């Protein structure tokens, strides 16, 4: 009651998504008239008619209420919502201008507005046989289509870990206290036998004496963020197939049995399916109230290169240890993106959309001429969540366990840094 319909509380009073309502909502019937009136303006058989009578007789559609979700992952992926709108009969307004000049004194010319008609809706259809095949091949080529980027990401993250380890060595040298031994890393960048000039200082030979290290760190962590972005974008596979289905509308008489209206309506129905992947443990209970942003990822990288920093003259130790700790925090946060990755969500959607139409008036010798434009009011749209996946999936846990291992190791390394 406190939270909106599609939400619920957790153990420690944390915002969470109510699956029972998300995937199994309470349908309800509705018969809310939208345009239960039509207006004819003009003259027919020398009779100016401008009445306004109703057109809608009875409505009935089942649908679901309004819901709210919240991302259940660091990347911000939201869960899918079960929705239904399956009108018993379709609806399409026709703002046509019927007119026809017949002999023996018989002319008609007027314009119709807010005139709709109900017709059958082909709900019974299933393209599973056509959609299921279009996953296996995609998965098989996946590794052949992105193994390159996954491998370069795996090496980039290990390179980040190596950089952080070298930085940790330098910091530990700083903490223990030594000017000459502190140059262990300094010799790892100059590519040359650098000689001293005078008596230096600990913080002086560490604040920017490691500019190549800082530049490398910034560059390759931006590199990893960029690849990361794509990689998590790569954890989703949506595919759909569309076909055309022409339909006929029953006869109708906008006037009082003065002229008949017939023709055809062109629609297409497309069946779509989308599979997703994420953690299989914390997906149900993902703390959205305590997470770090994504900007601090750039913040930490640029901090050491920032030539504006007063904490180097007040508390170097605190600032550098906080740098470590926040890096480890972000690392652990992104770690959950690769722990036990399996099918977590799945939706199947069936939707109908008009494309074209045709109109033909026939009362006596095909006297009517129609030049109208069609527009729909009600379209069949049914999107249901499903958990049964009757086909071989692409379980991407084994191919990501390495990344999880790497991030855990790096977090251990950085949390091992003490004041």
């Amino acid at each position: 009651p406190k939270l909106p319909r599609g939400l619920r509380f957790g153990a420690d009073n944390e915002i969470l998504n109510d699956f029972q309502e998300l995937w199994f909502p309470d349908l309800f019937i509705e018969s809310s008239d939208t345009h239960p009136w039509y207006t004819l303006k003009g003259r027919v058989l020398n009779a100016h008619l401008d009445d306004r009578l109703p057109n809608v007789g009875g409505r009935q559609v089942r649908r679901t209420p309004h819901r709210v979700t919240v991302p259940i992952a660091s990347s911000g992926l939201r869960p899918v919502t079960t929705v239904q709108y399956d009108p018993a009969a379709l609806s399409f307004l026709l703002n046509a201008r019927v007119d026809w000049d017949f002999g023996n004194g018989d002319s008609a010319n007027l314009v119709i507005n807010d005139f709709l008609f109900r017709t059958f809706a082909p709900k019974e259809f299933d393209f599973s046989n056509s959609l299921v095949p279009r996953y296996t091949q995609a998965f098989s080529a996946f590794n052949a289509k992105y193994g390159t980027m996954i491998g370069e990401g795996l090496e980039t993250i290990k390179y980040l870990g190596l950089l952080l380890r070298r930085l940790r060595e330098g910091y530990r040298a700083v903490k223990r206290g030594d000017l000459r031994a502190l140059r262990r890393v300094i010799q790892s960048y100059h590519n040359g036998k650098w000689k001293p000039a005078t008596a230096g200082n600990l913080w002086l030979e560490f604040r920017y004496g490691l500019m190549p290290l800082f530049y490398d760190i910034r560059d390759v962590m931006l590199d990893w963020q960029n690849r990361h972005d794509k990689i998590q974008r790569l954890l989703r596979f949506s595919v759909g197939h569309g076909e055309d289905y022409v339909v006929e509308f029953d006869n109708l008489y906008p006037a009082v049995a003065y002229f008949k209206l017939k023709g055809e309506i062109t629609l297409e129905r497309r069946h779509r399916h989308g599979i997703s992947y994420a953690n299989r443990e914390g997906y149900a209970v993902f703390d959205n109230g305590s997470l770090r942003p994504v900007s601090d990822w750039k913040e930490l990288a640029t901090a050491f290169i920032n030539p504006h920093e007063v904490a180097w003259e007040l508390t170097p130790y605190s600032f550098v240890v906080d740098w470590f700790l926040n890096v480890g925090d972000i690392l652990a946060q992104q770690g959950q993106l690769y722990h036990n990755i399996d099918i977590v969500d799945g939706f199947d959607r069936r939707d109908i959309r008009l494309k074209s139409f045709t109109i033909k008036g026939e009362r006596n010798g095909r006297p009517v001429n129609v030049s109208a434009s069609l527009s729909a009011v009600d379209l069949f749209y049914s999107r249901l969540h499903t958990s049964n996946l009757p086909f071989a999936t692409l379980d991407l846990d084994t191919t990501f366990s390495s990344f999880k291992h790497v991030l855990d190791s790096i977090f251990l390394l950085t949390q091992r840094v003490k004041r």
Binding site: N129, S130, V132, P133, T136, Q137, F391
Partner: protein
Amino acid sequence: AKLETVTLGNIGKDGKQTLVLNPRGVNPTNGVASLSQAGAVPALEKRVTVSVSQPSRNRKNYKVQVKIQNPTACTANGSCDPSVTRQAYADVTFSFTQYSTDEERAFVRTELAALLASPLLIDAIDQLNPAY
């Protein structure tokens, strides 16, 4: 393997149309006979080529190649000459050993025929539906 007019009937989804391919000249650069639509221009549009590769150092092991091409073309609203928008094509390659025998060859060919006629393949590429 005489070349002459070929009348394939019961063609298409419903198996009601018919296709009449006349013969053409046997490509002497590789010895390939060919048939094409009755004409006029579709004669240079839809093609059906027949090849029979005899044993040799590279071969062993006779081959028989049958290549069908059908280019779908359309006329832009304003142009005159139809330009090819899509093109469909298929190739069948039979490989037989030097001791192969006619019974088994015919066995194989008609088995291809019935397979193509069977629900399996008809679903698998009228709809592009791997068997699943």
